[PDB]
Amino acid sequence: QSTIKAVAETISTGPIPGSRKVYQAGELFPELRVPFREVAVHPSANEPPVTIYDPSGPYSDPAIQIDIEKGLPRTREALVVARGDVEEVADPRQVKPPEFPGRKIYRAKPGKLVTQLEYARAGIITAEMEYVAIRENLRREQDRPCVRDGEDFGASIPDFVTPEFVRQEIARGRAIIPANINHGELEPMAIGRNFLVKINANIGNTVADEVDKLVWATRWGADTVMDLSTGRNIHNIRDWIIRNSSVPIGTVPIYQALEKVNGVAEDLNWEVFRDTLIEQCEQGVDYFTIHAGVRLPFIPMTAKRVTGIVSRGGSIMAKWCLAHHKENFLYERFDEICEIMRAYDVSFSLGDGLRPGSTADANDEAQFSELRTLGELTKVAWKHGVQVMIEGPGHVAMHKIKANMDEQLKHCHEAPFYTLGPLTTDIAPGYDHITSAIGAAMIGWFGTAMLCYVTPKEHLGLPDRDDVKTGVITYKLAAHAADLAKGHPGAAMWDDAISRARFEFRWEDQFNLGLDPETARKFHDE
Amino acid sequence: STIKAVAETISTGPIPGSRKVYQAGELFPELRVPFREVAVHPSANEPPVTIYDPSGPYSDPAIQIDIEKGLPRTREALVVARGDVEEVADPRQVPEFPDTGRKIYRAKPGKLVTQLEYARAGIITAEMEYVAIRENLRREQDRPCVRDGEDFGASIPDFVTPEFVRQEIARGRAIIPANINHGELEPMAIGRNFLVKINANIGNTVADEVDKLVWATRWGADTVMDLSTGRNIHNIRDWIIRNSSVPIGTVPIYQALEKVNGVAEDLNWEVFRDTLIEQCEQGVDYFTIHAGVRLPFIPMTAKRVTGIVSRGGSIMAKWCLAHHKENFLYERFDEICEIMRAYDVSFSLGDGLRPGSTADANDEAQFSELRTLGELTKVAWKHGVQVMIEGPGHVAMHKIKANMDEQLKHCHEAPFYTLGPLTTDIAPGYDHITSAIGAAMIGWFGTAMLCYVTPKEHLGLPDRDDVKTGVITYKLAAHAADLAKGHPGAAMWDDAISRARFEFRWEDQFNLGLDPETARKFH
Ligand SMILES: Cc1ncc(COP(=O)(O)O)c(N)n1
Ligand SMILES: Cc1ncc(COP(=O)(O)O)c(N)n1
């Protein structure tokens, strides 16, 4: 009531300054409306508007009424039902505690295949695939010769993306579309090396503060969001997050499972984990970080490390294995995990439990032991038709970064790679968004598909909405620097547009074409 | 009055979490080479960490700051001791600084005076020892050493000796910017085989500028450039140089241009000549000079997206088109060297044609100028003048290595000095980040000094806080390159702070960071 009201007013909506929401309609599926934002420049410049990739969602479209009490419109629901492979859940799981308010809950019909991967391998172009192919082209036309200026290290970036190309990339496992059948609010996006580099923002510790940060983070360009909340009533909180999110939402299931056993790692068990998986599946979570690669024999390998085990979920599994002196039960039950996730088309984010937390620790036996295991677990996931991406480091000095990409590519069969940074030095607390931007831009260039961001508060405190924005802008510019260096066909038009504005002293156009127009404008001294 | 204000505004005293320490010279037993050291919790059982420190006497509690008298001229007696310079009989006289205690010097006819001349003559100078000590960070000399990095064919030693320094200088692969009239200077070296250095730009009043000087070096700026334009720039620079323990650079054309009332076309050799001599006697340590902007190169810039973005290169361009003559800096370059060599002023050969956008990177005009600079480098060396080369600019990541490769070849491995580069054009207000990605990579590849970029880049004038953000940003990029190169002293710092983090020694983690006060505030 009073809290749900203080959110509807505190969140930021309306057009992104200097631009406006535009849509492109689908052809294979004509009801699709794929969002972008467009920036028109001064008429005297005689230039066409600039199209920009836009994850902000309906929040920036003034024609749409926002009511978080009701959630966003479920514009994806009909398309999914339309395939006639899912059925309503008679009696879904309920979770007791602020409660969120007529959404039907779905599960694949017994014997039916429902994942984007399974559809692609069967030669089927789904609605999400066409939606994504449209999104990735930024409304470019094939009317002028396309000339490549970049180094993509053997990637297969096409001059123009087609729905058929998307299907091919997904079928081979080189790209994914995270899209739980129960996330009807979602605007589909793709993650893969042969597409734009995506970025991820982290949320999670009132409800308003977290919904706010979700809207704030996507407004500035976060392509996915992870709810990393821990403690009391995280499942209820996440309802508010997912129902009001137009971007894919990820989680670390073990956090919530651990809460069920009141924070005692040793008392974790398969039953509570499995139950957590189902609850989050019906809730609409799009991908799960699962640290199945933290195996028993790898744990002693971290004893000599300078900073040991820095992953939170990884440290929890470590505690469990050592307590029972048994193999990681997530690794042991890996097949039963696959059987659940595939019923709802949830994607794997195979966890970097043994990532380095200091540059001294980088590319060591423990980190690489896990990585090669992730490659093995990747193939098991494909067998069940589950979509997969691999998580990486971490803290890595610059000369060790290519080596990470080389290992991942070889050992994980070209599945998309998802990195946290990497931070290229340990000596600048307060500026870790910057130390990591260097590593992020480079590893993106080398072929990393998605970058998890870092705020200036890293290693020190909890990020406020200002820190979130800084992290997001930093990472959008690192992602784009990578696209540009790769010679991605859509990258140079943006830089060149802004440079022309600069050259002609078209100041306001310069601000409006920037990642953060209002800041540039404010800084500028007329 | 002005003295009053400045003394009040400036930041002095120990850098939080550390103390000033010195190592004495051995060849020259009177030398005192500064560092700052950070002690960790006694429970850690670790030696203190020695950190490179360009802050000068301002962070030394043994020294009482007096901006009216300037900094202690601790270098003067060493220079005089060599017996190669003499007082100038009739020095040039241009809020005026009380410069009564300082004698002005000039090489005696027929004597060696520059670091390069001394080095090629086989002489090890006081500045060379100074730098060698500074570059070792008080590490134990005799000790097995195993290097973990990739330096792309550099020649970085396990341990710097004054002799290695002399060799680097003599072959032209490093420099020590050290005007005989900058007696307050704490010597530093620039070269691929030393720690990556960074530069901070100041200049647009006095208190305003001196504060930025002290503030920038406080946070780690290795050199500073005075880029002031307009009236009274010479007299303002007095207040800066007399109070600077780091090398000071300028673009002399800015001052030459105020002599002719802002008319680029009214520039001539006579007014530039005079300017050079004024700055030589003042103590300026290096001159950015855009002698690479040649007449036939200018039309190459018409087809660019952002044209000519260098202020100095723009001024020269103007002059060349108006008189329809070759750049007189290029034409009279010999007489330029003859002036500089008399005071040991170093060349910073200008990047007049640097790319102002990623679309213009690595183009004909840019590399035409670069090849010209490599030719001028040889001429400068013939005159015994030290040389480093300026580069880009705006450059997409995939073109960055090619930039270094061209420079090493065409400029004979002289030190490279870049501005960024910015790796993308689309984030005005965040150009310290876009440029930091480029700066770290090109440093890794071999760039010796990196000119910083603030968040106000392209947009407005930096205030105190913007300068600090630029400096820390560039300190972190410089060190990330050292680390990646496998420089023998880099990992020790990262590992100390990593251990403090693992053991939850919060005070140590703060104090070992480039910015302790911010780290603690965020916590
Ligand atoms: C790529 C990635 N994955 C997950 C996490 C959080 O979870 P954890 O600290 O438990 O590994 C993270 N920060 N980055
Ligand atoms: C390395 C370097 N040199 C000079 C300048 C300014 O002078 P200009 O704009 O005339 O090139 C600069 N910003 N960086």
UniProtKB/Swiss-Prot annotation, chain B:
> Outcome of altering H394A?
5-fold reduction in catalytic activity
Q: Where substrate is bound, by residue? A: N201, M225, Y254, H290, S310, R311, G312, D351, G352, L353, R354, E390, Y417
Q: What function does the entry list?
A: Catalyzes the synthesis of the hydroxymethylpyrimidine phosphate (HMP-P) moiety of thiamine from aminoimidazole ribotide (AIR) in a radical S-adenosyl-L-methionine (SAM)-dependent reaction.
Say which domain of life the source belongs to.
Bacteria
Q: Which reaction does it catalyse?
A: 5-amino-1-(5-phospho-beta-D-ribosyl)imidazole + S-adenosyl-L-methionine = 4-amino-2-methyl-5-(phosphooxymethyl)pyrimidine + CO + 5'-deoxyadenosine + formate + L-methionine + 3 H(+)
What are the record's GO terms for cellular component? cytosol
Q: Which family does it belong to?
A: Belongs to the ThiC family.
Q: Assembly and partners? A: Homodimer.
Q: What is this protein called?
A: Phosphomethylpyrimidine synthase
User: Its gene?
Assistant: thiC
- Tell me one GO biological process term: thiamine biosynthetic process
> What is the UniProt remark on how the cofactor binds and its stoichiometry?
Binds 1 [4Fe-4S] cluster per subunit. The cluster is coordinated with 3 cysteines and an exchangeable S-adenosyl-L-methionine.
According to UniProt, this protein's pathway is: Cofactor biosynthesis; thiamine diphosphate biosynthesis
- Cofactors per UniProt? [4Fe-4S] cluster
Q: Does the keyword rRNA-binding apply?
A: no
